[PDB]
Design a protein around this motif. Structure first.
Motif, PDB file in Angstrom:
ATOM      1  N   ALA A 383       2.059  10.544   2.580  1.00 56.95           N
ATOM      2  CA  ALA A 383       1.237   9.649   3.379  1.00 56.95           C
ATOM      3  C   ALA A 383       2.137   8.832   4.304  1.00 56.95           C
ATOM      4  N   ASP A 384       1.518   8.024   5.173  1.00 58.17           N
ATOM      5  CA  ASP A 384       2.251   7.355   6.237  1.00 58.17           C
ATOM      6  C   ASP A 384       2.115   5.836   6.131  1.00 58.17           C
ATOM      7  N   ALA A 385       0.876   5.326   6.084  1.00 59.13           N
ATOM      8  CA  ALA A 385       0.663   3.888   6.175  1.00 59.13           C
ATOM      9  C   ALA A 385      -0.504   3.425   5.307  1.00 59.13           C
ATOM     10  N   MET A 386      -0.420   2.161   4.869  1.00 62.45           N
ATOM     11  CA  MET A 386      -1.467   1.470   4.131  1.00 62.45           C
ATOM     12  C   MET A 386      -1.182  -0.031   4.140  1.00 62.45           C
ATOM     13  N   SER A 387      -2.224  -0.831   3.884  1.00 58.59           N
ATOM     14  CA  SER A 387      -2.111  -2.281   3.852  1.00 58.59           C
ATOM     15  C   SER A 387      -1.942  -2.758   2.412  1.00 58.59           C
ATOM     16  N   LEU A 388      -1.071  -3.758   2.222  1.00 56.74           N
ATOM     17  CA  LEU A 388      -0.731  -4.258   0.898  1.00 56.74           C
ATOM     18  C   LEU A 388      -0.779  -5.782   0.891  1.00 56.74           C
ATOM     19  N   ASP A 389      -1.184  -6.347  -0.254  1.00 57.10           N
ATOM     20  CA  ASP A 389      -1.052  -7.775  -0.499  1.00 57.10           C
ATOM     21  C   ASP A 389       0.433  -8.124  -0.566  1.00 57.10           C
ATOM     22  N   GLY A 390       0.736  -9.425  -0.487  1.00 56.91           N
ATOM     23  CA  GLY A 390       2.104  -9.916  -0.548  1.00 56.91           C
ATOM     24  C   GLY A 390       2.873  -9.336  -1.734  1.00 56.91           C
ATOM     25  N   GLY A 391       2.194  -9.236  -2.883  1.00 53.35           N
ATOM     26  CA  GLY A 391       2.797  -8.783  -4.128  1.00 53.35           C
ATOM     27  C   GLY A 391       3.146  -7.297  -4.101  1.00 53.35           C
ATOM     28  N   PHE A 392       2.411  -6.527  -3.289  1.00 55.11           N
ATOM     29  CA  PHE A 392       2.611  -5.090  -3.184  1.00 55.11           C
ATOM     30  C   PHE A 392       3.549  -4.767  -2.023  1.00 55.11           C
ATOM     31  N   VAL A 393       3.573  -5.650  -1.016  1.00 58.86           N
ATOM     32  CA  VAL A 393       4.562  -5.592   0.048  1.00 58.86           C
ATOM     33  C   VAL A 393       5.947  -5.715  -0.585  1.00 58.86           C
ATOM     34  N   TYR A 394       6.031  -6.538  -1.639  1.00 60.59           N
ATOM     35  CA  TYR A 394       7.253  -6.732  -2.399  1.00 60.59           C
ATOM     36  C   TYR A 394       7.634  -5.438  -3.114  1.00 60.59           C
ATOM     37  N   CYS A 399      11.128  -0.582  -2.841  1.00 60.90           N
ATOM     38  CA  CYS A 399      11.045   0.870  -2.801  1.00 60.90           C
ATOM     39  C   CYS A 399      11.435   1.396  -1.419  1.00 60.90           C
ATOM     40  N   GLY A 400      11.918   0.498  -0.552  1.00 61.44           N
ATOM     41  CA  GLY A 400      12.498   0.889   0.723  1.00 61.44           C
ATOM     42  C   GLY A 400      11.439   1.166   1.789  1.00 61.44           C
ATOM     43  N   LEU A 401      10.233   0.630   1.582  1.00 60.51           N
ATOM     44  CA  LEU A 401       9.223   0.606   2.627  1.00 60.51           C
ATOM     45  C   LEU A 401       9.426  -0.661   3.455  1.00 60.51           C
ATOM     46  N   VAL A 402       8.735  -0.747   4.596  1.00 64.95           N
ATOM     47  CA  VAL A 402       8.905  -1.875   5.498  1.00 64.95           C
ATOM     48  C   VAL A 402       7.548  -2.355   6.005  1.00 64.95           C
ATOM     49  N   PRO A 403       7.331  -3.689   6.078  1.00 60.30           N
ATOM     50  CA  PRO A 403       6.181  -4.242   6.796  1.00 60.30           C
ATOM     51  C   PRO A 403       6.393  -4.061   8.298  1.00 60.30           C
ATOM     52  N   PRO A 580       1.641 -15.136   1.676  1.00 55.69           N
ATOM     53  CA  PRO A 580       1.624 -14.383   2.930  1.00 55.69           C
ATOM     54  C   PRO A 580       0.328 -13.614   3.157  1.00 55.69           C
ATOM     55  N   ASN A 581       0.178 -13.086   4.376  1.00 61.37           N
ATOM     56  CA  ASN A 581      -0.942 -12.226   4.717  1.00 61.37           C
ATOM     57  C   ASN A 581      -0.679 -10.822   4.182  1.00 61.37           C
ATOM     58  N   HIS A 582      -1.732  -9.996   4.170  1.00 53.10           N
ATOM     59  CA  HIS A 582      -1.579  -8.570   3.938  1.00 53.10           C
ATOM     60  C   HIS A 582      -0.874  -7.965   5.149  1.00 53.10           C
ATOM     61  N   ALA A 583      -0.035  -6.954   4.898  1.00 49.07           N
ATOM     62  CA  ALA A 583       0.743  -6.327   5.954  1.00 49.07           C
ATOM     63  C   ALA A 583       0.678  -4.807   5.834  1.00 49.07           C
ATOM     64  N   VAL A 584       0.678  -4.135   6.992  1.00 49.48           N
ATOM     65  CA  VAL A 584       0.744  -2.684   7.060  1.00 49.48           C
ATOM     66  C   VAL A 584       2.170  -2.262   6.714  1.00 49.48           C
ATOM     67  N   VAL A 585       2.283  -1.382   5.712  1.00 48.73           N
ATOM     68  CA  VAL A 585       3.561  -0.937   5.182  1.00 48.73           C
ATOM     69  C   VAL A 585       3.710   0.562   5.439  1.00 48.73           C
ATOM     70  N   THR A 586       4.882   0.949   5.960  1.00 50.98           N
ATOM     71  CA  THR A 586       5.190   2.338   6.264  1.00 50.98           C
ATOM     72  C   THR A 586       6.673   2.606   6.005  1.00 50.98           C
ATOM     73  N   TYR A 644      10.982  -6.699   3.844  1.00 42.70           N
ATOM     74  CA  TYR A 644      10.172  -7.382   2.847  1.00 42.70           C
ATOM     75  C   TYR A 644      10.719  -8.791   2.626  1.00 42.70           C
ATOM     76  N   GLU A 645      12.051  -8.915   2.657  1.00 48.01           N
ATOM     77  CA  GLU A 645      12.750 -10.169   2.421  1.00 48.01           C
ATOM     78  C   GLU A 645      12.547 -11.119   3.601  1.00 48.01           C
ATOM     79  N   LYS A 646      12.255 -10.553   4.780  1.00 46.66           N
ATOM     80  CA  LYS A 646      12.131 -11.328   6.004  1.00 46.66           C
ATOM     81  C   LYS A 646      10.666 -11.633   6.309  1.00 46.66           C
ATOM     82  N   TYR A 647       9.750 -10.920   5.642  1.00 47.40           N
ATOM     83  CA  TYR A 647       8.323 -11.149   5.821  1.00 47.40           C
ATOM     84  C   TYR A 647       7.830 -12.105   4.738  1.00 47.40           C
ATOM     85  N   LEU A 648       8.160 -11.786   3.483  1.00 37.64           N
ATOM     86  CA  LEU A 648       7.874 -12.666   2.361  1.00 37.64           C
ATOM     87  C   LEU A 648       8.933 -13.762   2.335  1.00 37.64           C
TER      88      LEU A 648
END
Ligand SMILES: [N]
Ligand SMILES: [N]
Ligand SMILES: [N]
Ligand SMILES: [N]
Ligand SMILES: [Pt+2]
Ligand SMILES: [Pt+2]
Length: 676
Positions: A383-394, A399-403, A580-586, A644-648
């Motif tokens: 898969a490519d992209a999905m939206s995550l809560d702050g806790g899942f953005v973490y 896991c080396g994904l990026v907001p 934080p807000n929910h963010a698109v992670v890819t 993730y460290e710069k968004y959260l």
């Protein structure tokens, strides 16, 4: 209770036999035992295990992938490590070392000069060429010929010199021994040091072994996959592949991965590194590297949720996939491939399906069971992209994904151009009790919005984890109101709900929510955890409820981190975290395309569309908050805030980080194994 270990030689069988004998003595009947099944190759061992004739064998990364493939479907269970407990080094990193400011990137390697450790070496040849595959001219077979036409000149040790001469250009003859000065690891390096080659495909540790001085190393950089460079010191962030050094594999199901760990844990204890001189697990009498590399200092348990593809990593599984499948596209090099969006509910799928058709095929959909499953699919490119809560953005971050995009909730004309950074989590307390500061919280009464809630539970407990350092959070506060806690705990003692709704996280609790925790505060609370604007809206006669009518702003002071107290309107300075807000992670590689497509899509189907009953809109769900939160107006770009460290918040991260110590994530434990 007998683990059938697999031997590939007669020498290995012997060691296995003595390993059966020595483990026989030191272990009670109620313990692990070793059997020695003897096949003729690693392949035969793989087929044996899968056919339930053996139980475990330890393999090089190449065979780890082979084991994963149908029909064998075998998984990593135990890892060998090559340092200390604090410095395991179970993985290595195939890198591309270059001259400083030599002025080119990964996608600019065509027509350059290259230095290889040797043809057929993983780090030196297989991995680089594997990645480079789609850039090689036709025909790509034989591989030697295509790489010859790719690089201007090269030093490819052990390559066919007579046939494909350009591979010997830097080291004529392509000597497959130390005779050749440009052979091996140090050789592939001094191929670059002598300026004969533009790039050397070696290991992260190679540079450190050749140049002892921090001075000289500074004229060398690494080529990163994203077409940036980095210092030779940041290899963990600029490598072509992370490769498991040695790994034990068993059946994906009914593999006895517990029996294996149990055995090897006790084996490394009794006969591990030096811990005996009667039998050495990592010492081979009749040969070298029998059953296990003699390098091995010990073993690590591989987390349960780990599949081979996850363990090897996408980069590695790209390389070999290319070398073997050899299937490159012919789709336009510039244009973006359709972005596979991940859905985790049936409605989420249905909404995604509608979106997909209206996106004219620019958006595609993938169904997964969990949110963690979705993240796994983004990781390994299912898969490519999905939206995550702050806790899942973490979790995705570790896991080396990026907001890339953030969900904006406040209507703003040029919102697309301004991220929000969310609200402010605060700990409020009555001004009267001047004694109350961040430190002396131990044993006080508390008020929470609810258990699991962001500002009401997460940030507080996460920060106050250092002050407790165990997972019994109810033992911090004497009494409290945390809607959702065990009815019998001390966090349910201050909740004024009648009947079944005594400590339930709903409206009938009355001490639930942001307003509710503040009522818990104003009546019978020593501290409440709410957002920044909870005080201003529940005081000054904004609330016509009984208890609230005549409560004023002045009466309450929010507590800070450094030990100080502040007034309510100075939340900006006196905060716990920036929930934080929910963010698109890819994935890092798809960052560009996702930024593009989603921005175009939100133009067509964004908040700016009325008659949402006659035309599809992306931000209205059939049920509730499908794909994106319904409060979304746009998707703001995260330039500068794209990790993730710069968004959260550094604070937010500390909190969720500590919290994830108590509440475990099978995916998080997996990604942190690969990158601690
Ligand atoms: N299975
Ligand atoms: N399975
Ligand atoms: N109450
Ligand atoms: N109340
Ligand atoms: Pt299964
Ligand atoms: Pt009440």
């Amino acid at each position: 209770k007998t683990v059938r270990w697999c031997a590939v030689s007669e020498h290995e069988a012997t060691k296995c036999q003595s390993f059966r004998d020595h483990m026989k003595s030191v272990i009670p009947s109620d313990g692990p035992s070793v059997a020695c099944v003897k096949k003729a190759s690693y392949l035969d061992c793989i087929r044996a295990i899968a056919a339930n004739e053996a139980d475990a064998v330890t393999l090089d990364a190449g065979l780890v992938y082979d084991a994963y493939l149908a029909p064998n479907n075998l998984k990593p269970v135990v890892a060998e490590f090559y340092g200390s407990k604090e410095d395991p080094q179970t993985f290595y990193y195939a890198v591309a070392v270059v001259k400083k400011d030599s002025g080119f990137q990964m996608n600019q390697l065509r027509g350059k000069k290259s230095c290889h450790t040797g043809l057929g070496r993983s780090a030196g040849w297989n991995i680089p060429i594997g990645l480079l595959y789609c850039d090689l001219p036709e025909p790509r077979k034989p591989l030697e010929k295509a790489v010859a036409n790719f690089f201007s000149g090269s030093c490819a040790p052990c390559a066919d010199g007579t046939d494909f001469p350009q591979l010997c250009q830097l080291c004529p003859g392509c000597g497959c021994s130390t005779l050749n000065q440009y052979f091996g690891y140090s050789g592939a390096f001094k191929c670059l040091k002598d300026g004969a080659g533009d790039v050397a495909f070696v290991k992260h540790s190679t540079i450190f072994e050749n140049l002892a001085n921090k001075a000289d190393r500074d004229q060398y950089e690494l080529l990163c996959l994203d077409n940036t460079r980095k210092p030779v010191d940041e290899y963990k962030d600029c490598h072509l592949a992370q490769v498991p050094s040695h790994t034990v594999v068993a059946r994906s199901m009914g593999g006895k991965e517990d029996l294996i760990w149990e055995l090897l844990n006790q084996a490394q204890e009794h006969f591990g590194k030096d811990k005996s001189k009667e039998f050495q697990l990592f010492s081979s009498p009749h040969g070298k590297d029998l059953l296990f590399k003699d390098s091995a200092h010990g073993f690590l348990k591989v987390p349960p949720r780990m599949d081979a593809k996850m363990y090897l990593g996408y980069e590695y599984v790209t390389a070999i996939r290319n070398l073997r499948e050899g299937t490159c596209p012919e789709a336009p090099t510039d244009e973006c491939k359709p972005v596979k969006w991940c859905a985790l509910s049936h409605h989420e799928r249905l909404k995604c399906d509608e979106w997909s058709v209206n996106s004219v095929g620019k958006i595609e959909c993938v169904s997964a069971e969990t949110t963690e499953d979705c993240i796994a699919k983004i990781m390994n490119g299912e898969a490519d992209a999905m939206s995550l809560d702050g806790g899942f953005v973490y979790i995705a971050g570790k896991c080396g994904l990026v907001p890339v995009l953030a969900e904006n909730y406040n209507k703003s004309d040029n919102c697309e151009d301004t991220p929000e950074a969310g609200y402010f989590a605060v700990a409020v307390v009555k001004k009267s009790a001047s004694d109350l500061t961040w430190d002396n919280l131990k044993g006080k009464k508390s008020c929470h919005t609810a258990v699991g809630r962001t500002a009401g539970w997460n940030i507080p407990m996460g920060l106050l984890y250092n002050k407790i350092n165990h997972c019994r959070f109810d033992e911090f506060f004497s009494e409290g109101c945390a809607p959702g806690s065990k009815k019998d705990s001390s966090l349910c003692k201050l909740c004024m709900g009648s009947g079944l709704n005594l400590c339930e996280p709903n409206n009938k609790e009355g001490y639930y929510g942001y307003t509710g925790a503040f009522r818990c505060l104003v009546e019978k609370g020593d501290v409440a955890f709410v957002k920044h604007q909870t005080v201003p809206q529940n005081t000054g006669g904004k609330n016509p409820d009984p208890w609230a009518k005549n409560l004023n702003e002045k009466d309450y002071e929010l507590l800070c981190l450094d030990g100080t107290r502040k007034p309510v309107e100075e939340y900006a300075n006196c905060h716990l975290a920036r929930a934080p807000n929910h963010a698109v992670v890819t994935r890092k590689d798809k960052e560009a395309c996702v930024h593009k497509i989603l921005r175009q899509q939100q133009h067509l189907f964004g908040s700016n569309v009325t008659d949402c009953s006659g035309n599809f809109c992306l931000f209205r769900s059939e049920t509730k908050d499908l794909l994106f939160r319904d409060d979304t107006v746009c998707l703001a770009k995260l330039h500068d805030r794209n990790t993730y460290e710069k968004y959260l918040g550094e604070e937010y991260v500390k909190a969720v980080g500590n919290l994830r110590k108590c509440s475990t994530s099978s995916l998080l434990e997996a990604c942190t194994f690969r990158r601690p």
